[PDB]
């Protein structure tokens, strides 16, 4: 099935559909709590 996983840096755009106007945008490249593994 189609899987969208935003577990890497991504972009979002909040836009107004009737007029196709971008109200808000952002990029997310990081979290807060750093993690390590074996």
């Amino acid at each position: 099935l189609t899987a969208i996983v935003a577990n890497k840096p991504f972009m979002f755009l909040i836009y107004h559909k009737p007029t196709t106007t971008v109200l808000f945008m952002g990029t997310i490249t990081k979290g807060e709590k750093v993690i390590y593994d074996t």
Binding site: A3, F10, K17, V22, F24, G26
Partner: protein, 293 residues
């Protein structure tokens, strides 16, 4: 256009950045009613910005110091076009901040001491607010701690998870998807862009690309796994706006704001935007205030 092209100069590889192109564009559009000649021409912006009161609240105010003579036709033009009157203010006193915050609510973003100097003779302020639920919310009880891979660093984020039918599609130049998460109003929506190289997406983003996305996304049953996030960004846009051709407004020798003021001593020193976006299982809360000088 300018609003959307500004994001490429505040985008950060090593940080989380949130931005309001609409909030910038709305501010510049007001600033344009005061400009003339070349200064106005370089403020290349729609003379009318869209407004819709259910989908988002937007606000526009101008605070001019009481010393500054304003052509009466500017304040008439200003009042008739933005349903609000220029607020005469004293930019040296101590409660000027209090006057201005006490003015915005009713109708309070005090994170604007970054932007008030003591020689400040005008404040052009654009506020954008949106708080809306998803059309199909996530279930918080299925949100789990999951890894987030940023280069070689890994983080533990609060990840949401749901099944939903949404418009989606894959694309290249460098491989990515775009997915539309509608809000409960269904006039506003979130496009989620998941790429193999974010910086490449940033350097290509424009309104053609966005409309392309909207035309070529196709409905489909999806699993959406995305983090909750809360981000606040305080951005200085002078450098970006100059690189996008807005230069005269900042140059005291060349700045024509003669439609506002016979003074010939009003120009822009700073353009600052503070934005905050919060996305979680229930929906999104987004806020942005743009301050010109």
């Amino acid at each position: 256009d300018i609003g959307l092209w500004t994001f490429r100069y505040v985008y950060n590889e090593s940080d989380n950045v949130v931005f309001s192109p609409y909030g910038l564009t709305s501010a510049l559009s007001v600033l344009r009613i005061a400009a003339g000649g070349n200064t106005k021409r370089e403020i290349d912006v729609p003379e009318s910005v869209v407004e819709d009161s259910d989908a988002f609240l937007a606000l526009r105010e101008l605070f001019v110091d009481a010393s500054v003579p304003l052509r009466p036709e500017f304040t008439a033009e200003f009042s008739s076009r933005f349903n609000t009157s220029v607020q005469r203010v004293t930019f040296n006193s101590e409660n000027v901040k209090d006057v201005i915050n006490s003015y915005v609510k009713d109708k309070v973003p005090r994170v604007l001491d970054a932007s008030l100097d003591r020689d400040t003779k005008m404040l052009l302020l654009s506020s954008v607010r949106m708080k809306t639920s998803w059309r199909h919310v996530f279930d918080p009880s299925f949100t789990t701690d999951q890894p987030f891979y940023s280069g070689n660093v890994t983080y533990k984020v609060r990840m949401m998870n749901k099944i939903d039918t949404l418009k989606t599609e894959t694309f290249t130049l460098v491989g990515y998807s775009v997915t539309e998460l509608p809000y409960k109003r269904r006039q506003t929506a979130m496009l989620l862009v998941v790429p193999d190289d974010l910086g490449e997406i940033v350097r290509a983003l424009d309104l053609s690309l966005v409309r392309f996305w909207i035309r070529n996304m196709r409905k489909d049953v999806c699993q959406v796994v995305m983090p909750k996030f809360s981000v606040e960004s305080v951005l200085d846009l002078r450098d970006a706006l100059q690189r996008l051709g807005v230069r005269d407004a900042f140059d005291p020798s060349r700045a024509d704001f003669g439609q506002a003021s016979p003074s010939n001593d009003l120009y822009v020193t700073k353009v600052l935007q503070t934005s905050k976006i919060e996305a979680d299982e229930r929906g999104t809360t987004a806020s942005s205030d743009t301050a010109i000088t």
